[PDB]
Design an enzyme around this catalytic site. Sequence first.
Site, mmCIF file in Angstrom:
data_model
loop_
_atom_site.group_PDB
_atom_site.id
_atom_site.type_symbol
_atom_site.label_atom_id
_atom_site.label_comp_id
_atom_site.label_asym_id
_atom_site.label_seq_id
_atom_site.Cartn_x
_atom_site.Cartn_y
_atom_site.Cartn_z
ATOM 1 N N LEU A 1 0.798 -1.236 0.000
ATOM 2 C CA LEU A 1 0.000 0.000 0.000
ATOM 3 C C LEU A 1 0.834 1.292 0.000
ATOM 4 C CD1 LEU A 1 -2.813 -1.043 2.527
ATOM 5 C CD2 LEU A 1 -3.117 -0.615 0.072
ATOM 6 N N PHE B 1 10.887 4.875 6.724
ATOM 7 C CA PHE B 1 10.736 3.849 7.756
ATOM 8 C C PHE B 1 10.768 2.446 7.143
ATOM 9 N N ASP C 1 1.043 16.289 14.670
ATOM 10 C CA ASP C 1 1.050 16.138 13.198
ATOM 11 C C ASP C 1 -0.341 15.780 12.658
ATOM 12 O OD1 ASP C 1 2.242 16.277 10.664
ATOM 13 O OD2 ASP C 1 3.072 14.251 10.754
ATOM 14 N N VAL D 1 4.031 -0.438 4.085
ATOM 15 C CA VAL D 1 2.708 -0.718 4.636
ATOM 16 C C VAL D 1 1.930 -1.640 3.706
ATOM 17 C CG1 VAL D 1 0.456 0.217 5.214
ATOM 18 C CG2 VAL D 1 2.512 1.431 5.935
ATOM 19 N N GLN E 1 5.331 2.914 0.409
ATOM 20 C CA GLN E 1 6.738 2.839 0.824
ATOM 21 C C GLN E 1 7.161 4.140 1.510
ATOM 22 O OE1 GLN E 1 9.754 1.145 0.836
ATOM 23 N NE2 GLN E 1 9.764 -0.413 -0.782
HETATM 24 C C1 BK5 Z 1 4.159 2.610 14.990
HETATM 25 C C2 BK5 Z 1 3.541 2.207 13.642
HETATM 26 O O1 BK5 Z 1 2.108 2.089 13.783
HETATM 27 C C3 BK5 Z 1 1.404 1.978 12.611
HETATM 28 C C4 BK5 Z 1 1.086 0.721 12.089
HETATM 29 C C5 BK5 Z 1 0.352 0.614 10.898
HETATM 30 C C6 BK5 Z 1 -0.066 1.759 10.220
HETATM 31 C C7 BK5 Z 1 -0.795 1.659 9.029
HETATM 32 C C8 BK5 Z 1 -1.228 2.815 8.375
HETATM 33 C C9 BK5 Z 1 -1.908 2.754 7.176
HETATM 34 N N1 BK5 Z 1 -1.491 3.348 6.068
HETATM 35 N N2 BK5 Z 1 -2.269 3.116 5.145
HETATM 36 C C10 BK5 Z 1 -2.109 3.632 3.769
HETATM 37 C C11 BK5 Z 1 -2.609 5.088 3.696
HETATM 38 C C12 BK5 Z 1 -0.640 3.527 3.330
HETATM 39 C C13 BK5 Z 1 -3.279 2.344 5.520
HETATM 40 N N3 BK5 Z 1 -4.326 1.834 4.861
HETATM 41 C C14 BK5 Z 1 -5.198 1.065 5.498
HETATM 42 N N4 BK5 Z 1 -5.053 0.786 6.795
HETATM 43 C C15 BK5 Z 1 -4.021 1.254 7.509
HETATM 44 N N5 BK5 Z 1 -3.939 0.952 8.804
HETATM 45 C C16 BK5 Z 1 -3.083 2.065 6.861
HETATM 46 C C17 BK5 Z 1 -0.892 4.057 8.892
HETATM 47 C C18 BK5 Z 1 -0.160 4.158 10.078
HETATM 48 C C19 BK5 Z 1 0.248 3.011 10.746
HETATM 49 C C20 BK5 Z 1 0.975 3.126 11.936
#
Ligand code: BK5
Length: 260
Positions: A16, A21, A129, A24, A18
């Site tokens: 989804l 870090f 943020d 995803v 890059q």
């Molecule tokens: C300390 C790390 O904690 C997290 C772990 C997973 C995460 C996933 C998403 C997420 N991005 N996106 C698309 C916009 C790229 C998502 N799309 C669907 N579901 C999601 N949950 C995400 C965002 C922030 C996140 C932070």
Amino acid sequence: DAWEIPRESLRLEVKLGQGCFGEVWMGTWNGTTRVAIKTLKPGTMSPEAFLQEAQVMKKLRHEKLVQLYAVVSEEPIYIVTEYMSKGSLLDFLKGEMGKYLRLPQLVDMAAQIASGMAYVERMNYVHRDLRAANILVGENLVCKVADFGLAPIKWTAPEAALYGRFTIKSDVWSFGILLTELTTKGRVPYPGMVNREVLDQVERGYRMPCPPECPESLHDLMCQCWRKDPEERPTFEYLQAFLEDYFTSTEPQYQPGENL
Ligand SMILES: CCOc1ccc2cc(-c3nn(C(C)C)c4ncnc(N)c34)ccc2c1
């Protein structure tokens, strides 16, 4: 720690996004549960630094914060959260859905974000943020606050940007900017202005005008969020109630237009 899961229990299906870090992914967990998975690229970034954002997700729990499900806290690190089917709010607003969103949907989205931030407020945390790119959208226009890695001059309150005074009141300022993202279908704020010109203009008393077809009443709320003095800006509790009640208490004569 009970958040830990075995590596074999995760399947990474569709990539989804890059970044610096890592990555995803949309995936499955235990073969049954749709999930989103974030990976850290081992040699890219500090592992001790990355798990502090996950620690913050272990404590906070609310229907309008993206929920932590599980972790693999040994390199290569994996973080598992609920899956938000519509991606970032920024992408949603700019994309093919944006053109059908009207003020009622957008204010209701604002209200949910305010609800999550009201919980952050009650818990005495600070996001730092808040902006459309850090909100995620699910089915039925459900919106959730995401990305506490910090917990973008155009979204940051002056006192925070200039002097490092980050508070829940600087988040309110950002929420005010986020209202413009919502009402312009996700245009970058202060259009035609570079960062340095935004800072001088804002301190000299400049604020973005009423977006096209945005009711003056909603722009006044934006202006309340942008008061020079942080203490005179409204609370998230207040913002939540105002937005929830908007179409009865403030704009009961609202008519659909071309864009809003
Ligand atoms: C300390 C790390 O904690 C997290 C772990 C997973 C995460 C996933 C998403 C997420 N991005 N996106 C698309 C916009 C790229 C998502 N799309 C669907 N579901 C999601 N949950 C995400 C965002 C922030 C996140 C932070």
